[PDB]
Design a protein around this ligand. Structure first.
Ligand SMILES: O=C([O-])C(=O)[O-]
Ligand SMILES: O=C([O-])C(=O)[O-]
Ligand SMILES: [Mn+2]
Ligand SMILES: [Mn+2]
Lengths: 115, 115
């Protein structure tokens, strides 16, 4: 199958994981589609000023691929500035967050893979 | 960890899986780092006229997320026009290919998840 991102209605989430402002999440493939091996495959849009709040992953890991804009990725107690083209990897047992510190939308892909 | 795409030296590959022309692949995360749950997380670049040739996947599935450009994704005997923002899903037992039928570069993420 092909899924045209452009044509998936995002869910608007306020204070996602305790973050700032409103964020949009477009689910691109279901976990069932992904044979229960990954539980999330989504495109996130963070308006200027918004963030996904600090939260922990256990028994899984998450990858962000930054698609557009700029911001700051927090992982293992460190802030790292990120931009389009960056991969952010969060391992099992770590906590992370991400904030849009620029003036255009920060978009990225998020994939959570089990165990 | 953060991995900055632009700073990875791609591997140049001619006639990838029997395709046309020469493509570039940047491996972004190793299988090890992904706990042996995925065997590939790469950013591919196809110049116009180039393709990843037809090939079969077994015991795993693969996702392309299109980054830039346009082209044609072949799956289950059908040619499907794709463009930036599209997700291409190839399930286990299926065969796929992708060709840059456009006039600029076609870039995409490829992830192969096991079982
Ligand atoms: O949903 C999550 O875990 C995320 O987006 O980081
Ligand atoms: O090598 C593969 O499986 C691919 O890139 O589609
Ligand atoms: Mn997370
Ligand atoms: Mn393939």
């Amino acid at each position: 199958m092909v899924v045209r991102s452009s044509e998936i209605t995002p869910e608007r989430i306020s204070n996602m994981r305790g973050g700032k402002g409103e964020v949009e999440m477009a689910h691109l493939l279901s976990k069932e589609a992904m044979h229960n091996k990954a539980r999330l495959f989504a495109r996130m849009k963070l308006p200027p000023g918004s963030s996904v709040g600090l939260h922990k992953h256990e028994g899984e890991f998450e990858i962000y691929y930054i698609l557009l804009g700029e911001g700051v990725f927090h992982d293992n107690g460190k802030d790292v500035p990120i931009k389009a083209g960056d991969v952010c990897f969060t391992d099992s047992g770590e906590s992370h967050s991400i904030e849009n510190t620029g003036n255009t939308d920060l978009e990225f892909l998020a994939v959570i893979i089990l165990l």
